[PDB]
UniProtKB/Swiss-Prot annotation, chain C:
Post-translational modification: Phosphorylated to form H2AS128ph (gamma-H2A) in response to DNA double-strand breaks (DSBs) generated by exogenous genotoxic agents and by stalled replication forks. Phosphorylation is dependent on the DNA damage checkpoint kinases MEC1/ATR and TEL1/ATM, spreads on either side of a detected DSB site and may mark the surrounding chromatin for recruitment of proteins required for DNA damage signaling and repair.
Annotated domain remarks: The [ST]-Q motif constitutes a recognition sequence for kinases from the PI3/PI4-kinase family.
Assembly and interaction partners: The nucleosome is a histone octamer containing two molecules each of H2A, H2B, H3 and H4 assembled in one H3-H4 heterotetramer and two H2A-H2B heterodimers. The octamer wraps approximately 147 bp of DNA. Interacts with NAP1.
GO molecular function: DNA binding; protein heterodimerization activity; structural constituent of chromatin
Protein name stated in the entry: Histone H2A.2
Note: In contrast to vertebrates and insects, its C-terminus is not monoubiquitinated.
UniProtKB/Swiss-Prot annotation, chains D, H:
Post-translational modification N6-acetyllysine, affected residues: K1, K20, K28
Location of this chain's protein in the cell: Nucleus; Chromosome
Job of this protein: Core component of nucleosome. Nucleosomes wrap and compact DNA into chromatin, limiting DNA accessibility to the cellular machineries which require DNA as a template. Histones thereby play a central role in transcription regulation, DNA repair, DNA replication and chromosomal stability. DNA accessibility is regulated via a complex set of post-translational modifications of histones, also called histone code, and nucleosome remodeling.
Residues modified to N6-malonyllysine: K20
Modified residues (N6,N6,N6-trimethyllysine): K43
Subunit structure, as described in the record: The nucleosome is a histone octamer containing two molecules each of H2A, H2B, H3 and H4 assembled in one H3-H4 heterotetramer and two H2A-H2B heterodimers. The octamer wraps approximately 147 bp of DNA. Histone H3 is a component of the UAF (upstream activation factor) complex, which consists of UAF30, RRN5, RRN9, RRN10, and histones H3 and H4.
Positions of post-translational N6-succinyllysine modification: K43
Chief place where the protein resides: nucleus
Cysteine disulfide partners in this protein: none
Secretion signal, residue range per the UniProt entry: none
Name listed for the protein in its UniProt record: Histone H3
Residues that bear N6-methyllysine: K1, K43
Note: Present with 213000 molecules/cell in log phase SD medium.
UniProtKB/Swiss-Prot annotation, chain E:
Protein name, UniProt field: Histone H2B.1
Organism: Saccharomyces cerevisiae (strain ATCC 204508 / S288c)
Keyword match DNA-binding: yes
Full-protein residues shown: 36 to 126 of 131
Lineage: Eukaryota, Fungi, Dikarya, Ascomycota, Saccharomycotina
Family: Belongs to the histone H2B family.
Superkingdom of origin: Eukaryota
Gene it is expressed from: HTB1
Annotated GO MF terms: DNA binding; protein heterodimerization activity; structural constituent of chromatin
N6,N6-dimethyllysine found at: K3
Subcellular location as annotated: Nucleus; Chromosome
Post-translational modification: Monoubiquitinated by the RAD6/UBC2-BRE1 complex to form H2BK123ub1. H2BK123ub1 gives a specific tag for epigenetic transcriptional activation and is also prerequisite for H3K4me and H3K79me formation. H2BK123ub1 also modulates the formation of double-strand breaks during meiosis and is a prerequisite for DNA-damage checkpoint activation. Deubiquitination is performed by UBP8 in presence of SGF11.
From Swiss-Prot, chain G:
Main localization (coarse): nucleus
Organism: Saccharomyces cerevisiae (strain ATCC 204508 / S288c)
Parent-record interval covered: 24 to 103 of 103
GO biological process: chromatin organization; nucleolar large rRNA transcription by RNA polymerase I; nucleosome assembly; positive regulation of transcription by RNA polymerase I; regulation of DNA-templated transcription
Family: Belongs to the histone H4 family.
Designated name of the protein: Histone H4
Localisation: Nucleus; Chromosome
Gene from which the chain derives: HHF1
Length: 82, 96, 103, 97, 91, 101, 80, 97
């Protein structure tokens, strides 16, 4: 729950995700590098989310909070709380 | 704990009925449509406001909105939307 | 009676006028701008709703699955060209395959 | 002889299945453990609701699927079909990330 | 005619920071674009967070939080400290 | 001028009037323009000091566009803030790869 | 007439040299010319739209700046 | 003994010279009447001022040079010394276009 859960996105999970990109073979070192990329993106989103949460005088983080966090990325298409 | 809210479920209902009286409607599509409506609204309004500020005009009229729409939207969509907007503003002025 | 009915709309136009007025846009708001916005809603929502029904009949479902939303987005060139990065709400994607993979 | 399919044969009907079906493909509880373990560092003892978790996984899944499609396009551009580290880094760099 | 520009203002910025090297008009234009764009971005996103914060009146705290959420760590924190100190001085 | 009494160099009054008339809020806190101007001089001073350091690196007493370009590219925080920003006469950094050598 | 060909083959060769290419394919020159045509048409449809809106027969620097603003280019310097 | 340099090194010296000098690579009048031609079809009877056109040429040159740099990075990705059409299309497509 709070210790070494980065393996939640597992190697078979990464292989299945790469199946959706249209690839036949996934190399061994692909899994951990895409894990690091996902970690970086998730950290970048959640930093903005938690900073907004602190600004809003709120203790809980809502879905619309991360919606605004991703809003300044610059696309903002459909989704919950759009 | 609520009295009145501004949602577009009646709008999608009647538009689908006037388009095809054979399709159902859910609220998830209602929310997604509301999101896209809001985003396109701020896009059009901000583009028109900044364009009016570019033309040193402090009064925002239908011309600014129509030009902003014609420059943001794809050419065929832009032209059709501008024609519809021109006819709508003319009929609204006639009705007053 | 709201002035949308005589103009072919349904809005209480004062609602949108207040939204623009409190939106910190301009000191003077054109009266025809909210009406044109209502017309834009009517027709853009018409075409998007017909896309949603298009993808719904693609699966013979009277209700929607967000797969219908994804099909409506990706089968329309202008929607895909406009914006496609932010999450699709349970709609999935369209996995495009190549002609060199499969034997 | 056993009906051993050649590599790349089942993939046809498999992509026929999962292109139409639109369910999730990642274990939920490990993912919520991950989002917790990354949240406590930013803010401990967060009282997570039932929401604000599925949106994150859907968003990251869409982003990584787009990245994987771009990586496959780069691999085909590289006169090959398989994925590799260089394909991923090139796709990410050309995406502005 | 008299216009509002940061010519003398950025000039005395330089004279307060680096009174040794002059500035060209190309760098004046670049700095003017930078300062203007930063101004509008902070103003608009602070206003929109305030609208989300159901407040129609903006105070120094809103600008403080807005800068702390847009800017990177060191820049945001230094801006927070200096702006809070200046506001507490003035009011 | 009340800009000087704030410890500020950018015009506090002019920036306050821009905030009030910039379609931002009906009631603009008078400390908000001071805060904004403070951020602006902080960033401008960072840019100027990095440009001066780059000019000293190139043995030049003037801030040429190449100096400012190299100054921004040498700062990771600046690159994160300004990554897609393209500056004339700055060209690109001397980036080479040993594969083509 | 035929003014797009005014950009010469040695000019594209030097431009690709700026791209750090030792040997450049022959079709690459005309491909670069074609993507340049697409770039200019995408910019200039918006520029002409803004010009027509602006109630001005002359395309000004601010006109080009506003045309470039929407497409995410956001240039600096000219009309900044 | 004619003095003919081996291919490749003069390319490097040209790259260095174009790196030091940041002048416009396309003559002004060619861009002038190209813009005039491409604006003829949109609206007739349009006169172009002295300005607003050097900005177009500098923006096009800068973004096209960035595209060339991305294309060359993808070419090194492809392990070759030549630019290719698939290189250019991968550079364009992966950049959100």
């Amino acid at each position: 729950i709070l210790r070494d859960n980065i393996q939640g996105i597992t190697k078979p999970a990464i292989r299945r995700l790469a199946r959706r990109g249209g690839v036949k073979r996934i190399s061994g070192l692909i899994y951990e590098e895409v894990r690091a990329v996902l970690k970086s993106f998730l950290e970048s989103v959640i930093r903005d989310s938690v900073t907004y949460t602190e600004h809003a005088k709120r203790k809980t983080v809502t879905s619309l909070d991360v919606v605004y966090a991703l809003k300044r990325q610059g696309r903002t298409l459909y989704g919950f709380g759009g | 704990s609520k009295a009145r809210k501004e949602t577009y479920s009646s709008y999608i209902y009647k538009v689908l009925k006037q388009t095809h009286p054979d399709t159902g409607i859910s609220q998830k599509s209602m929310s997604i449509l509301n999101s896209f409506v809001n985003d396109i609204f701020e896009r059009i309004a901000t583009e028109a406001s900044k364009l009016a500020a570019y033309n040193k005009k402090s009064t925002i009229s239908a011309r600014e909105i129509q030009t902003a729409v014609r420059l943001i939207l794809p050419g065929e969509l832009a032209k059709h939307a501008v024609s519809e907007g021109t006819r709508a503003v003319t009929k609204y002025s006639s009705s007053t | 009676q709201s002035r949308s009915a005589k103009a072919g709309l349904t809005f209480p136009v004062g609602r949108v006028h207040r939204l623009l007025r409190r939106g910190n846009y301009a000191q003077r708001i054109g009266s025809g701008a909210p009406v044109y916005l209502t017309a834009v809603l009517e027709y853009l929502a018409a075409e998007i709703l017909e896309l949603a029904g298009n993808a719904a009949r693609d699966n013979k479902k009277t209700r929607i699955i967000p797969r219908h939303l994804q099909l409506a987005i990706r089968n329309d060139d202008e929607l895909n060209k406009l914006l496609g990065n932010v999450t699709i709400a349970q709609g999935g994607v369209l996995p495009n395959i190549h002609q060199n993979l499969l034997p | 002889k056993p009906h051993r399919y050649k590599p790349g044969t089942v993939a046809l009907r498999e992509i026929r299945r999962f292109q139409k079906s639109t369910e999730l493909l990642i274990r939920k509880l490990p993912f919520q453990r991950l989002v917790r373990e990354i949240a406590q560092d930013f803010k401990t003892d967060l009282r997570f609701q039932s929401s604000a978790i599925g949106a994150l996984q859907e968003s990251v899944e869409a982003y990584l699927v787009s990245l994987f499609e771009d990586t496959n396009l780069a691999a085909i551009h590289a006169k090959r079909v398989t994925i590799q580290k260089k394909e991923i880094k090139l796709a990410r760099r050309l995406r502005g990330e």
